[PDB]
Symmetry: C2
């Protein structure tokens, strides 16, 4: 658990920011270059607020699988000079299962908070409030709203982005390496 | 940092509970026997809610120093059979300063959350919203309300209880071993 928290703290400090869209405040992870990811429900507009400063959004991809199914992630390309530390080598080729994960949240409502969720299992398919969603990861933790965007991590691995919950279970979209080109 | 989080997680799981008084929801730490501590502002009544079950409060001591100054902690003795794991040997004789601390919160608004606050320094005297307060510990973290009661920890040490903040600084009351007799 300790090494996962140590990994998470350094990761969040280096690659995470707090983002405000018209739909709420979210944790955001920069992946490489000027590309980041948000949970789909952040519905970013043509501009976002990133650490309280206004930033233009050049592109927004709502990710779906080959048979069109919802993946619940939105990739965005930001209009800014500074480049994200490349973290693509932390992203698995496929769904990671682990016995000890930490979920990191970085917003106003949850500033630098970390949650031990323990075991993460590829749950896979999920009807996420009406929408057929795939590549879900599940862990047991008493969900609240505003955790959306939280980053799911273990030692050396960024596993996914928190996208939903039901009182004792949380769901992350798996953050796969191939999303990133 | 990792060992502190590992310490905190096990400590919270063993000795902490979520408590509702008429003044709010708070993290509570059981110390030994049927004695626990709350931040003063929890103002517990003759009964509390502890993990959603009603519990009688046999005694409540608002702690002050020898010259009467506010210490911002309330000790309470609970009317229940189950005994707290004795954690008095984790409590320092005097104010602990450390370079890496973790603040643990366990309520509905913040369920099993952990925050790296880094360096804790005996700040000592503080005018805590009108009240002259002593034996304060200070750390830098972007405070929100509902963190009251949070438990401040490092590897092997329970340092204090979170009692106040101002946007970038948090304050804990030092949890001294001698309070406990």
């Amino acid at each position: 658990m300790g090494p996962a928290f140590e990994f998470a703290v350094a990761m969040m400090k280096r690659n995470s920011s707090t983002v405000k869209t018209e739909y709420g405040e979210f944790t955001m992870l920069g992946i490489y270059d000027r590309w980041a990811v948000l949970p789909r429900h952040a519905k970013p507009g043509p501009t976002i607020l990133m650490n309280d400063q206004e930033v233009g959004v050049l592109d927004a991809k709502e990710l779906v699988d080959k048979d069109g199914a919802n993946l619940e992630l939105t990739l965005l390309k930001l209009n800014r000079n500074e480049k994200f530390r490349d973290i693509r080598g932390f992203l698995a080729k496929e769904e990671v299962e682990v016995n000890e994960a930490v979920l990191a949240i970085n917003t106003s409502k949850f500033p630098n908070m970390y949650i031990p969720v323990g075991q993460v299992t590829e749950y896979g398919f999920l009807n996420l409030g009406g929408t057929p969603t795939k590549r879900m990861l599940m862990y047991n933790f008493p969900t609240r709203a505003g955790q959306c965007g939280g980053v799911l991590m273990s030692t050396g691995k960024v596993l996914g982005i928190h996208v939903g919950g039901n009182g004792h279970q949380g769901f992350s979209a798996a953050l796969l390496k191939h999303y990133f080109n």
